[PDB]
């Protein structure tokens, strides 16, 4: 097997795209691209689509676990919430892409160890006033799971203690940070 088999991923993941159009409805500007369950199939995907820095304003990329949709109305998201990374305008150039690729590697690599199942997916927002990257998790009351994910993520993105990042539930956002790391 060692010689000819693809390296398999624990989960199947689906990459989604959100387009800015504003005439059309949200449920129509959100559209699937492709699914994949191997390392090699992930690179074939990653290598031919555009970088986050080159997307027109208001557009999103999303990687979610197969069967969970990148909207908080979904069963696995509704009690959930998200670790949020806020990027200033200058960080588009320097940090946005390398943070996005690191996020994708955390997800597909299953890097949050015994709380891997709490992770649903991640969303990059390309915006004129400040880009954003969020890892979404399934239950906002799992203090232990939510905390560990945050710390893993900051560590992996390489942020210093100085920087503090917020976790907020989708309820609180529809309607402050429940947790900070």
């Amino acid at each position: 097997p060692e010689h000819y088999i693809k390296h398999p991923l624990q989960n199947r993941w689906a990459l989604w795209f959100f387009k800015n159009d504003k005439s059309k409805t949200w449920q129509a500007n959100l559209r699937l691209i492709s699914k994949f369950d191997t390392v090699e199939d992930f690179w074939a995907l990653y290598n031919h689509i555009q970088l986050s820095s080159n997307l027109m304003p208001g557009c999103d990329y999303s990687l979610f676990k197969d069967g969970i949709e990148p909207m908080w109305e979904d069963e696995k998201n509704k009690r959930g919430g998200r670790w949020l990374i806020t990027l200033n305008k200058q960080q588009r150039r320097s940090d946005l892409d390398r943070f996005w690729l690191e996020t994708l590697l955390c997800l597909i690599g299953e890097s949050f160890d015994d709380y891997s199942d709490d992770v649903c997916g991640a969303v990059v927002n390309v915006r004129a006033k400040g880009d954003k990257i969020a890892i979404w998790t399934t239950e906002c009351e799992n203090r232990e799971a939510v905390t560990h994910i945050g710390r893993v993520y900051k560590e992996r993105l390489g942020l210093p203690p100085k920087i503090v990042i917020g976790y907020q539930s989708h309820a609180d956002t529809a309607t402050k940070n429940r947790f900070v790391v």
Partner: peptide, 12 residues
């Protein structure tokens, strides 16, 4: 259960 490090994923 399949786990891969940052280094494993870039190498592959």
């Amino acid at each position: 259960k399949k786990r891969y490090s940052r280094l494993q994923l870039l190498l592959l």
